[PDB]
Each structure stands twice: as structure tokens, then as C-alpha cells.
Write a protein that binds this ligand. Structure first.
Ligand SMILES: [Ca+2]
Ligand SMILES: [Ca+2]
Ligand SMILES: [Ca+2]
Ligand SMILES: [Ca+2]
Ligand SMILES: [Ca+2]
Ligand SMILES: [Ca+2]
Ligand SMILES: [Ca+2]
Ligand SMILES: [Ca+2]
Ligand SMILES: [Ca+2]
Lengths: 453, 453, 453
């Protein structure tokens, strides 16, 4: 109808159901609008800023905001939130002594952040040497998403001043140098970052002076769940709005984990498979990492669902989700990046997850060279196994810093198994993997994924 | 009706009685609204800000305030009040000499506090070495309730500057080092903290510039009673509005201590039992600590009440209440965390406080290992005893720094007994507890609670 | 009609089709208006600022903006965007030691930029010595396009102060001088530049105080493609607005690469040939340099087009295009700047690209003196070859740092061939070029172009 409780130019009936923006006006969603390229939006009819960002639902949906904001933040359920961190490129120490850093700022959010003023800590071993706020020489005027300051091809900015105006960074005593010579080196971490956001005033100009991102950080972090996606080299962090559990007046729409991922990362869905930029981010092709609360919530909710899939679990406020695209992934259909081919593989099957499976009759042993491996790193080998007989056990031998010999009992249906090991030393013993089964098994989606060192 | 004396969008009749917020409008409370999850609110019809905070009754009730504010502060009788303290994580001294601290700020209130600027004192023994206000490098942009700055996983921020811009902390003379070498160490206490609160302006943005928390601290502290709850590791401080005694024009609603606790901490009530987060905070399961004025007020009011319970005493302005969840608690029904089982215990009874009691025929002696004990600490052993005969006396022997031998005369009904002792030295004599009675007694709710060292 | 969705004084029908400004009002475009000197403008009817600059479509089209802005930015599809860089004219080092620079700012954009405050890095070899922001003494009040500060005839401005107020630039230790004496010299690069833009207020005056160019840099860079033109001595950088691919609500007009170049550089078109300032910038007379993404996009789009020309490819958002006017260019019609004439050239032909071709029967060898050559530089020799027989192969011998002997198979129609070599040392061996073919070939548009050293 024409009822607007929160006065954001979108009718309450349109917000409760689907709606789309055409010619800068909101209209009812129709299933025939998807082939033209339109997207269906849903938002709370009792709140103008469903996601908690400075931009209302209408501004996000109609694209009436800064054009450097990523389109993923045009969804009213996805918050435009800059994530900025400081990377320490180089360290210089020279005479007490003086210390200097070459650093570069990174942005992994959905919104640009003007006037970047990071605050950093200098910690050697537990003890924090100094806390430094960015001075006038170390302030970035612009920082667009998926971009750095200084940009690519430019040297990292210098940091040598402790306080305002002119100052020199200096350890308090010779003990710092004494423990530096022993073999202890210095970290750098970011405690907070200050910056501005852009709005259009009554004169049509863009102002970024009185608009502070710190006025919305606590609000966004309290009404949303965090989803992080790592692709080995690039990382993307997103916040998705979720409804309150015990609040009856909370009208935030409810979406699942897969729907939230698709909304936050704008991943193309080809019927059922989900692709980010041609890289499959489907549930069975990636590693999912959760904290204790999210893990227990998902385990509790899974038993009440017949499908029993992570992507079908309703998103809830306070969730932290990490997605790790496997470094090595083979499915015997369209991708096999392993430098060395597997042993005793039969592709003549039709019982696989997507197209076919691997009919293993005996054992499979793989020799992985360490040239394409990262030393001093923890890895996880994951896979999907199928055994209708449920009478054969699989024993696995993994070569690592400590030799691992483990046993597994496959189930009737496809079951995921993951084994964690650690590799230390580049010029060390070669990594060997072996798995032997009593009879004939089905294997699919074998992955090697890096974890924290 | 439609009479609004204070002009806060809530009718006076609705405020005097119960009311609830539905579709952003206030409506009469109905007993059938509780099963939908709604809450009943009451507030003064002669004051827009009943609790004394910057947010009016309508804004609190309808949730038109900053979303990082805890839901306990959505009650008009509970004030959104940040409680911020500075914890001194590490101390570094090195050459006169120079001193540096690694500190972290903590928030235990219901509202976020922006631009945290604490003021701290450096006291060694009585004499205050220096008073330091937080500089630009030591200011926290955001500080959400139940969160720290820097957040978990980040090193504590450094403090080495005395005055504005650039300065070095330094003792005035060698006497400081002379008495430091003797074995005297340095404390750190917070005298005041400066910060901002968030409000939405006419343009829909959030501004935290001219909004100071110091404009409301004295007002809140003068029209409210303080309730603190300690759970061994976490502490929560709340302020609950109370009416003036001699003022006839004060229309603040009157609530009891149990109702105030439930409102302030959002504790679930399962008929009669009260739980915070699964931890029972019922009157008989926790330790209640009061100052002299509150103690005498409660003792005076108890004699005029037939029920004779602390939680049924009307809350009054100026009250200070402390709740300490017992470290060890046994009730013989659903909880027994004592590492060593009790002696001569008979659970076959039906005269207990909730389900059953302990039928002790003789004596009970418990040997508590000091591995799960805190040395150099004062402890209290509390319990509930019942003796219909009223002819048997109970003598208790408690091993501590000084051996305690005390006598008790149980009453006809259940009576609470508390004994205070001190344990000194980790590698000291083991703690022994014994209590002997002439005949058969009923024992329930035995608790061991830590006190100040 | 009279429908204005974005309220920029231009009807939507006029924006969708062509329109022109007459007597400060927008009117329908007519084909008879071109002979009077009028230009046809197109812009999005759903956005007031199609290009993303602080000036709306009407202000750009009608010339209601600062008069120092170049007329190329009067097109609503071309953004008024200043490009400012710092050129290091001289370096002085003298005693640790002190360092001073003589520098001059350059502007290669379409808009003037007031209050220029560049930020620069001092890098010797990887390590960044210091980052310096322009102080009060090094700020340029005005910087017009194609102009410098200080202007021509004035000495470059001095830079010797590191921080605010008064400071002296100084290396941290003697290691800087130690590696300077070895033969390592210092670069200077610009990380960012701050400045203002001019707008007219309600009183008719021009204000450049609160108008910051950093509020529009990220917006312009995200909705436009960059085109750079280098003419050996002068460089011009432009941004041309392009539409979003997947957005159905993006109404930005679509133009080709040649049309975009003509719009951005105001190049006169004499039917088909395109001239910048009498220098032909036609597709076959210049070198086109693309990044990987633009190269693959253009290759993909070319196969779907019958004409198969770069200038007919539709411009797309995110494109980076570089145009290099060849240093030496001969076409046997109206231009031959080679100091030494070619060998075995027959101009009696009528099958050339524009007027005639070169009928080569045998081989062509050219001796190019190094007096008009730049030592330690990489060069490219390009040309167009035609062979209807398609039975003769052409072998080329190029003298350089390494002697190059390459083979080529000409096609039936005109085909472009490019060969890259490097010349090192002014007092080195003379450069020789030779190319021999089995039979009779057609040669046209022979060019020598400088590349990066
Ligand atoms: Ca609405
Ligand atoms: Ca809404
Ligand atoms: Ca498969
Ligand atoms: Ca009222
Ligand atoms: Ca009121
Ligand atoms: Ca009991
Ligand atoms: Ca228009
Ligand atoms: Ca327009
Ligand atoms: Ca020609």
C-alpha cells in the first residue's frame, strides 16, 4: 500500500515482502524481474537502517550513496563496513638506538574510508614498547575497498615519529637492543583506525568532515554476524544483519548461511553450485571454521533439520564464520591441481556428489613435493568417503613432523573426514600420504588446506 | 487516555499502569502479551527521563537508541550507564629512572562509551607520584559493554607520557627507587573517565561530539541505587531508579530488590527460581553484601514484613547491593562442585528448601585440597540448618591461619549461618572443616565464597 | 517533454537522446546545429553527476563552472579531474648530513586545483627514508591544467623540512651516506596530493575552502576508465564515465574507444582521420598499450565485430588505455621524419591504407644515426605489411644490445607487425635495421616508438 512506519520511502508491505528499485522508486517484486537483472531486497519495516550503517535502506537499495562503495553493500541486509589493517613491510633499527618502520594500509571491506588514522602497538615479547597514532605525514586521504595506501607500485610509507609534530622513536633502555640481539624480533598490531565516510549535503556536494566511522562500529558489530572468506592471497570480511532472538519487535528478515554468503560476496549461483569469481565456494568444496558458540549452535540446529547441511542453517546474530578455499582440490570432474597424480584411481562411476566418484579398490598413496608447499605450516587433508557395505575400515599414514597413523570407519552415505598435521623445515623429509581400505570405497572431493602456522 | 504531561509520547494513565511498545506506539499492557515475548514497562508520568540518562522513557522502551546499548537498559527504570575502569597489566622501570605501564580499559556497564579518556593516579605507598590524563595515543574510539580496549588477542596499550604532546614519566628523586628496591610496589587507580554517548540528529546520522557522559553522572548517581553482581571472573554494575522518600511529587514506580535485580540483569524467572545465564542468583544461593545504611534499613524493614526475605524489601534511593555467586555450592539436588565428597550424608528427606535436605546424624568433616583454592585470601563458609527439636548445639572447627572453634544454636526453622576465615600460603597446612551436632539435623545449601584478600 | 527525474534542469527525454545548451537552456539536438559549432551531449537521466565530479550535468554542459576548467570537461561524460605530480629537479646533500630538494609540481588534468599539498616519499633502495607532507612554505595557491608551480622561468621550490613548523631533513645514520657513496642515488614519488575546487555560493563569490578533491577521487576512479596520451614531451590523462555491466538501473550512455578519445581530448575529426593539435592520433598512426584485463576484453570483443578495429570497441568501466604518438613515423604520403631516407622505395601504388603504399621489390635497409636517439632506452619498430600472394616470408635483422634475427609470415590483407629492442650506450655501435622479402610486398606506416627504459 502506502504505509511507511519508519519513513524511508519504502512501504511496509513492500519491505515485508520483496521489492525492487526501478526509476528511483520502489515497486513490488515480480519473478519476471530477475531475467532483466534486478535483485530482490527485503528489510525491516520498523527501522530505516536495517544493517546499522549510516545509509538507510532506500539509499542502499537505490544506489544513492558513494559510488566507491561495493555493490554487495547495496543490499539492505549487508552493511557497508570498512575493514582496515596495517601491514609492516620493513623494519629498520640504527643508533640510544632509533627505530623506523615501512608500513602499508590495507582495506578489505565494502566501503571506502577517508582520512585513515590507524593506531598501532610496538610489541617485542609481551611488553608493548610504544603506542603510536598516525600523524599528519602518515594519513591516507582515500582508501578504496580492495586497495592499499600507498597504492601498488609505490614504496610503503615511513613511520618514525612517536608523538605529535616532531618526535623520534627510541627504546627506553639498552635492554631492548640486548634482547633484540639474542634473536627476538618485533611485531606490529593495529588497535583501532579512525576515518570518515561520505554523504551528500543540501547543496549536492560530498562532505567527509563531521562523518566519523567510530559512531557506527559498535552499532554494526552488535546487530550483525561476521563472515570472512580467504582465497590464499586475498581476504574479504563482511557483516550481515541478523534479527534478535527474544525481541518480538525485531523485524529483520531471516536468511540462511548460504543465502547470507551469496548476498555478502555477490556469488553467482548456477542452479545449486556457488562461485565467487569462478572459484567454487560451495559447502563441499571449502573449509568452514567456526568458534565454539557458533559450532555448538550449528550442531544443535542441524539435528532438527532433515537435509543436514551447514548452508541451510538460519543465520543468527553474533555468528563468526570463516571460509578457507582449499589450496589443493580434486574432484575427478573438472579440477585437479595436484602436481603428482593419484594412484589406483577409477573414474568409471555414477554415484558421486555431482557427476562421478572415485572407485578405489585397494589403497591410494600420493607423494607431494615440498616445492609447492609452505614450510613451518599446519595443514589439513579433507575428503568425502562412501561405503555402502559399512564393513571396511580405512587406515591412513601421514608423514609430518610426527608420523600419524589413524583409523576411520566409513558410513553408509558420504561422510567428511579431516586430518590435521604440521610440516616443519623446507629442507626436510618429503611429505608422504597413504590410505588403505579393506575393500572397494568411493572417494570424492580431496582437499589440502593451509591453516595457521 | 491521551494525556501526556511530560510530552514523551506515552499517556499518563499508561505510565502509571503497565504499557508496552508495539509497532513503535505505546499500548495498554495485557496479561496475554507476555507469551508473545513482550515486557511490561512502568515509568513516572511527570518526568521524561525517569532513570536520569540522556534517553527518554519512550526512546528506551521502543529501542530508538544506540543498538550497542544492552537490552537491560531498554527498561525505563534501568539507566544506561557505562562503568569503565583501567587495569594495569604490566609495569616496566628502567633508567633519573623512567617508568612505563601496559594497561587495558574495561567496561562493565550497559552502554557503549566513545572517546575514552581515563585519568589515573600513580601511588606507591600513600604518596601519589603523578596524575596522568589519557593523551591522544591512549584514547579508545569505541568501548562496548563487556568488552575491552584493546580487544582480546591484542597487547595492552602503552602509557609513558605524563603531560600533553611529548613527555616522559620520571620519579622526582632517587628515593622512589630506594623504596622500590626495599620491596614496595606501585598501584594504579582511576579517578575519572571521560567519554561520549551517541544520539541521532535531524539528518539521521549519529553524532558523538558534544554529547558528554559527565553531564549525567551526578544526576544518575543521585536518583538511583547501585547493584553489583560478581561471578568470580566477570562483574556487572547497574543503577536502578528509585523514588524520593519525602517528595510527594515523585512518581517513580516502587519495586522490590528481587524485581530490581531481575530488571537490571535480565535474569530468567522459572516461577520462583532466578537464573542469570544458567547460574542461579536466587536469594538462598548467593552471598549478599551491604553497607551499614542499607543493612540497617533492611533490618528495620524486615521486622515489619511477614515473609522476612531480602528480595521482598522495597528498593530505596541510595542503596548499595553486592551479590557474590558462591565459588563452591552444594544443595544435594542438582549441583555439587566440591572436589571431595561430604561425610555422613543422607539424601532421603522431603523437608528441604526446594526438593530435599541433608539428614545429618552425627558429624560432618570435609577435607578440601588447596589446589583449587586461592592463597592469601579470606573465605566465608555459609549454610542453612534446621532443627525442630531446638535442643542440640552444633560446634564447628575450621582450620585456617588461626584455628577457629565456634558454637551455634540452631532454630526451629531453617536458619543461615556464616563463618569467616582466612587462608595464607599456598604451600601451607591443608584446610580442614568439621562440624558436630548432638543429634539429627537438616543441612542445605552449603557454600564456600571468596572475599577480599 | 518536461520530466526531470534527477532534477538537474534537463528533461529525461533530452538526456536519453541528444541535447544542446542554447541561451542557458537545454534544447533538442538538431543535425543543423553542428555547423554553428554546437556540440551534442548525452548523459544519464537518473543521475545528476554522470561523471562523478562535483559539477552536475547542466553545469558542465552550460559552462556554469570555473572558467579555468578545460572545455573537454564541459562534456557530461568527461570528468573534470586534476592529475598532479611532483618532479624532483635537483638534489643537494651536505653535512649527521642534511638533505634538500628542489622540486616543481605538474598538472596534467582538466581542472585547476587550489591549495596544492602533495605528500612525497624519499626512497633510496627499497627502504623509504622519510614521508613528507607539504608545509606552509611549499603550498601552491593555484595550479591550472598544463601548468606548473612555480611557473616557467621561476626556480623550483625548496624542500628541506620534515615536519610541521621548523624541522631539518636528516638521514638516521651514516649508513645512508655509506651507500650513497657506493653509487646509489635517491628517488622521489608522490603518494597523494591534497587540494581544493571552486564553487560559486549564494552571494556570487567563489569559495575554495571546504571543497576538497579527496571527496570525489574514489568516486571518479570507480565509475570511469582512464585514457592517457603521451606526445614525447607532454602527457594528458583523462577519465571517461562508463556504465556498469550487470546494473539494469545504470543509464550511462555507451560510447566507443575512438569516440571516447575524441570526447576526452577534443580531437578534430576530418571525416575519418583524427588529429589532436595537427598531430594524427588515428588508430594506425599511434601505439596502443593496454593492461592484461583490457587486452583480453578487447581481444574477446574484436572477434564478434566484423570491422575488427580497436576504436570501434565499446568503452567499459575499469579500462586503462595508453596512447604513444610514435617518435618517427613515415607513411609515404605527407610525413617522413626519418633523418636517413629508406632504400628501394617505390611510391607508384594505389593500394595503401589512405593514399598509396610502398612497393618493395627485394629488401629495405635503413641506417639510423644515434644522434637523434635516446641511449639506455627500449624502442619498438612497427609497421603494416601486405602480401596478396601469401607465399613470401620476411626476415628482419635489427642491431641492438643483442642482435635480433626474426621471421614473419605476411597475410593477404594489411597486418601490423611490431618488434621490440633495446639500445644501450650513446658511444656504442650504430643501429642498423634490415628486412628482406622473397618477392614484392606492400609496406605502409613505419614507426619507431620509445618505450620505458
Ligand atoms: Ca518502511
Ligand atoms: Ca526500513
Ligand atoms: Ca565428483
Ligand atoms: Ca507521559
Ligand atoms: Ca515519563
Ligand atoms: Ca536442597
Ligand atoms: Ca534529467
Ligand atoms: Ca542527468
Ligand atoms: Ca600510406
Amino acid at each position: 500500500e502506502d504505509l511507511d512506519t519508519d519513513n524511508d520511502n519504502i512501504p511496509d508491505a513492500y519491505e515485508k515482502n520483496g521489492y525492487t528499485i526501478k526509476d528511483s522508486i520502489a515497486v513490488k517484486w515480480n519473478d519476471s524481474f530477475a531475467e532483466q537483472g534486478y535483485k530482490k531486497y527485503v528489510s525491516s519495516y520498523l527501522e530505516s537502517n536495517t544493517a546499522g550503517d549510516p545509509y538507510t535502506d532506500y539509499q542502499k537499495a537505490s544506489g544513492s550513496i558513494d559510488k566507491a562503495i561495493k555493490l554487495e553493500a547495496r543490499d539492505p541486509l549487508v552493511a557497508a563496513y570498512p575493514v582496515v589493517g596495517v601491514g609492516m613491510e620493513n623494519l629498520i633499527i640504527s643508533t640510544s638506538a632509533y627505530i623506523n618502520a615501512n608500513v602499508r594500509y590495507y582495506n578489505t571491506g565494502t566501503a571506502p574510508m577517508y582520512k585513515v588514522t590507524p593506531t598501532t602497538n610496538l610489541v617485542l615479547d609481551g611488553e608493548t614498547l610504544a603506542t603510536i597514532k598516525a600523524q599528519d605525514n602518515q594519513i591516507g586521504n582515500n582508501l578504496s575497498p580492495n586497495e592499499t595506501y600507498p597504492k601498488k607500485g609505490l614504496s610503503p610509507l615511513a613511520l618514525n615519529t612517536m608523538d605529535q609534530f616532531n618526535a623520534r622513536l627510541i627504546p627506553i633502555n639498552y635492554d631492548q637492543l640486548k634482547k633484540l640481539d639474542s634473536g627476538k624480533q618485533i611485531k606490529l598490531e593495529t588497535t583501532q583506525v579512525s576515518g570518515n565516510y561520505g554523504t551528500k549535503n543540501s547543496q549536492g556536494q560530498i562532505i567527509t568532515e563531521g562523518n566519523s566511522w567510530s559512531n557506527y562500529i559498535s552499532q554494526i558489530d552488535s546487530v550483525s554476524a561476521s563472515i570472512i572468506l580467504d582465497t590464499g592471497s586475498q581476504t574479504f570480511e563482511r557483516r550481515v544483519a541478523a534479527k534478535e532472538q527474544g525481541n518480538p519487535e525485531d523485524k529483520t528478515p531471516e536468511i540462511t548461511i548460504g543465502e547470507a554468503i551469496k548476498k555478502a560476496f555477490s556469488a553467482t549461483k548456477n542452479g545449486e553450485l556457488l562461485y565467487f569469481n569462478g572459484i567454487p565456494i560451495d559447502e563441499s568444496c571449502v573449509e568452514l571454521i567456526f568458534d565454539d558458540n557458533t559450532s555448538e549452535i550449528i550442531k544443535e540446529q542441524l539435528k532438527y533439520l532433515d537435509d543436514k547441511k551447514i548452508y541451510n542453517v538460519k543465520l543468527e546474530r553474533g555468528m563468526n564464520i570463516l571460509i578457507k578455499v582449499p589450496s589443493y582440490f580434486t574432484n575427478f570432474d573438472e579440477y585437479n591441481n595436484f602436481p603428482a597424480s593419484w594412484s589406483n584411481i577409477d573414474t568409471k562411476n555414477q554415484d558421486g556428489l555431482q557427476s562421478v566418484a572415485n572407485k578405489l579398490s585397494g589403497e591410494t598413496k600420493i607423494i607431494i613435493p615440498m616445492s609447492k608447499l609452505k614450510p613451518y605450516k599446519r595443514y589439513v587433508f579433507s575428503g568425502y568417503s562412501k561405503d555402502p557395505s559399512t564393513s571396511n575400515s580405512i587406515t591412513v599414514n601421514i608423514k609430518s613432523k610426527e608420523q600419524k597413523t589413524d583409523y576411520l570407519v566409513p558410513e553408509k552415505d558420504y561422510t567428511k573426514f579431516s586430518y590435521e598435521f604440521e610440516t616443519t623445515g623446507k629442507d626436510s623429509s618429503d611429505i608422504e600420504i597413504t590410505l588403505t581400505s579393506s575393500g572397494v570405497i568411493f572417494l570424492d572431493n580431496l582437499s589440502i588446506t593451509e591453516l595457521n602456522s
